[model samples]
Target: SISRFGVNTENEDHLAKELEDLNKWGLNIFNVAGYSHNRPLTCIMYAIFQERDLLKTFRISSDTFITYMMTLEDHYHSDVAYHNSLHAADVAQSTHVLLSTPALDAVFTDLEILAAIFAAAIHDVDHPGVSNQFLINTNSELALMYNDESVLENHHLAVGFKLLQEEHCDIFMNLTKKQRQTLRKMVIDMVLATDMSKHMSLLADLKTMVETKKVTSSGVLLLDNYTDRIQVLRNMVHCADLSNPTKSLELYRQWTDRIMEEFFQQGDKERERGMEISPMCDKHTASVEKSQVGFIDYIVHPLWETWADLVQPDAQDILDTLEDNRNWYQAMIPQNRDCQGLMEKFQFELT
Candidate 1:
């Protein structure tokens, strides 16, 4: 029975009814045993399939689907900080929430939704606990292979797509050739868009969307065409990628610790190589509170602000949390009343 059927479902009780609601990124919140990381990602993945009634379309039995899940989960290195299965699971849920937006209820095609969720789940696959800058500075094979452009992202895409090449895991195998081509292009664009280097350009397009603010005659939120449609999908994935600040600060802080830990490990390598330590990686110079303030101000806030505007009131709550998180870090920025620490460290804020 075990060999032919290929799995077990005795632990279905772990997915509590509350977990089924999936109200937030915290919606895929906690990780329980045997399922821990498996639960969150599969929860939303299966939910999307169930809701879309796609099970029969893909001809994917539950056991086969779980097998596919196991393969995907293993590609995510548990040892890697900040970009492991847990983050992937949570981000997948985030993608689902963004897709389920009432404003965007009928905007995306089923293929696009599948691409969005697939992109979110594997966007950071095979991350090596370092940054592109780190890879370039070190001049590693990966940096050379990608020519130092979106190094980690290229690898993740390669490994992920290669994994899907196998017979057992080809989820897109069920789709028509034209469908496969469209999904391939969208998935590539979405994953590559996750690269931080394109953040500004993507946000520019998003800002334009918010400024002009398009909708249908009946107010169904029309994209008008593929160009505009893809832009929204691109930014939706980006928003989820940077969604850390929009979570509860307790959860946000937990993520912060992992990323900072990864950053410092990279810094350690830089120091060993006698190379200049990157900003936010310097043991002697890094300031967590202040760095977070700058991140939210310069990066996270601007992106989320555009996203919240894109969805308007649907996203207002997340934006509210972003503002609170920003203020939290701004307050966390330390100061010396004597003018030494405050002036040198946070002089701009002090005024």
Candidate 2:
């Protein structure tokens, strides 16, 4: 039945099983990559169209949806290794599961869910396999174009909206003008939150929200204002973006490998340009294990702790998985011999 997407009969059953993992944090994105023949468009279609019934809800034509998604998928650079279409699909699926949290069940409006999923899918579109700092330092064209402010994030937003302007790929064509404007604003905010520079402020806002969280008489959370609503959605997409270290150990390690490769490539470029190599980018000096421990401690663990509290019991399993993965990486650090010093460095910097 999914043959239209080019998934062969032999892999169809396996692909279905992988899609079912969407509900679990341990979704095997690599298998989906294989089953879908490297076209993550199929994975997103399953999540957005079939699983969530967004297509019918939005009144988007099936053919037009496919056209838009395929174009979006093609825009992700496969050669980049990390910021590619599969990562987009993985983040989108992660966003789906997080939104399904029981404490917040049915809390989001239809438009919010649509915006969250859409933001995750296209948040990294047209990524050029380098960080914003790298672009700014090298004076890349993109850096100049955006005046060095959130270079990659701004580019991704521009390219994503540009794709929608094509009539055949306009998934939101059915929405009213007001609805379109609202969706556009939401998507922009969510995508911009993915920029690492805002990580501290975003987490701080989330902590403040959780401390003053309001809930209904039935125990479900309440979001009474647009600012509070959009803030929650922004943090949700941020969580999905940083979800790599929180997944099952095996899956987490695979993402670590890909990201490290991307980093090492950037380091090589910097070296060739006679520029100073960034931390964790030089594969020679980078301890893959130690970096993960630092990342989990400084970034992933703190965010998830606040997030788990916000969702209470529903996110406990995810929090536990993150702890287990963190321990595994911590244990690996002992082999590096600089474990104590690395831990101290992260403490001095992030703390």
Q: How do the residues 1-351 of candidate 2 rate in per-residue lDDT, one tens digit apiece?
A: 465443443578787787777677777888888878787754555555567888888998777887788888989998997999989998888898888888787888899999999999999999989888899889999999999887899999999989997769999999999999999999999998898777878888889999999878888888888898899899999999999888888888889889889989999999999988877888789888777777777778899999998878778888899999988878876544534443332222232
* Candidate 1: 10-residue stretch with minimal lDDT: 342-351
Residue 260 of model 2: what lDDT?
A: 88
Q: At residue 8, what lDDT does model 1 achieve? A: 34
What C-alpha RMSD separates each model from the true structure? Answer: 5.5, 3.4
- For the record, the alpha-carbon RMSD of candidate 1 to the native fold, in angstroms, is 5.5
Off by over 4 Å in 2: 1-9, 335-351
Full-model lDDT for every candidate: 0.74, 0.83
Compared with the true structure, what per-residue lDDT tens digits does model 1 show for residues 27-104? 535432243434455555666566666667656676556656667777888787777777887777788889888778
What is the lDDT for 78 in model 1? Answer: 76
